[PDB]
Amino acid sequence: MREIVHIQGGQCGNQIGAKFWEVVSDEHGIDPTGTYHGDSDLQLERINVYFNEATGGRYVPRAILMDLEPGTMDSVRSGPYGQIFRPDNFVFGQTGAGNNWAKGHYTEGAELIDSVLDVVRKEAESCDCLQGFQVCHSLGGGTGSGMGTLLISKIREEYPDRMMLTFSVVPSPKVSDTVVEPYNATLSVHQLVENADECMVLDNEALYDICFRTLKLTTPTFGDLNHLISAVMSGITCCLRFPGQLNADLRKLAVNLIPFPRLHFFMVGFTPLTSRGSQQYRALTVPELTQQMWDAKNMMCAADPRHGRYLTASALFRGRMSTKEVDEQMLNVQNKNSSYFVEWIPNNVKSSVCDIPPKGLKMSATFIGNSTAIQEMFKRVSEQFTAMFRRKAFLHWYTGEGMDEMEFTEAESNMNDLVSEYQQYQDA
């Protein structure tokens, strides 16, 4: 019951998809062999949300790795946890993608959709009652941004009732990991405004400072940033996989979050986060977690809460704690700094809780907030897009794949119609 299915499309998706399944595999006490080696029966109770019982008592994931140029898959096929995947759940094409939205969405994408859909349905029926999908993106690239949305446009039409989350990694504000980041952003965002129920936005910039300032790390490898992304993605299903004195399923999280069908761009964080030294200084109490989670640093996205107004918010605590504390805390926050919140919503937070913390900790939290400062990223990018599209730089690459110019202006206007949605509801 409440089965999920996980998609990993792209180089980022295939890589953070590794660390993700590395965390959950530990959380349920299973070894890279695929066998269970935990202690409690509680591990095996809701394991079927992410895995599939096999012969001889194995548990293999239900992920789908799809990517052109299987190079980066040859890595995860050779990592420590590379033995758990079904080799059949690997979709790859012998051609490069070129960091180009077009061929990842029109030419090369269309040659693999026959396989990917034949793959997703092999397990969308292995679920007794499917809860919803869950993907990982890289909006700058061509595989994750072309095949990603192309698959979504297919997912939305055969399974509209179900829910699809999206941990999309957005372009950075200051540095640009790609020169054609704008075109790949808008053309994808336009796809996400119509075919997405929820969509977190994570930026590689904020992940660095959090790994620099708060975590005091010296050399933050991408293996470390994904120990963060994995932490929050695991923090959403704790109500699904584990008991809780106030559970909160995946659906009741959106209903309670997006007031309008378009404003599904959220902002996340994780607590606690301390260096190896400061662990011995600061206590682990509910007022601590809520002090760091509401901060403007733990926001994995590069959007400042102190500029816009929180439409709604969330919090998923994990640990045997006192549910009075969480309720009075989240009330005080809205009470004191009562200008960051809109007024036509009396109480605009939800607060889950779970009897089960992570495997190494005793108390943890997890934050999701739907602010109006998210309009800033779509403003910063809608300026860079219209800057170079005005002179038609790098366009002979896109138009060479049967694209047009209406497929551009449509993408831009549909984004500008979204930036106004985030302005009306900002009454300062």
Add this chain to the structure above:
Amino acid sequence: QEESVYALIPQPPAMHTSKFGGKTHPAQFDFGQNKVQPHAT
């Protein structure tokens, strides 16, 4: 033979449709699934 020249020459629905009638639909039946789709499987 009986002098019966008058008797010599002889000169003389939709089934229904029951009310209960109906095609079985994949509902009101606990044995099987409860949906109908074009090309799911």
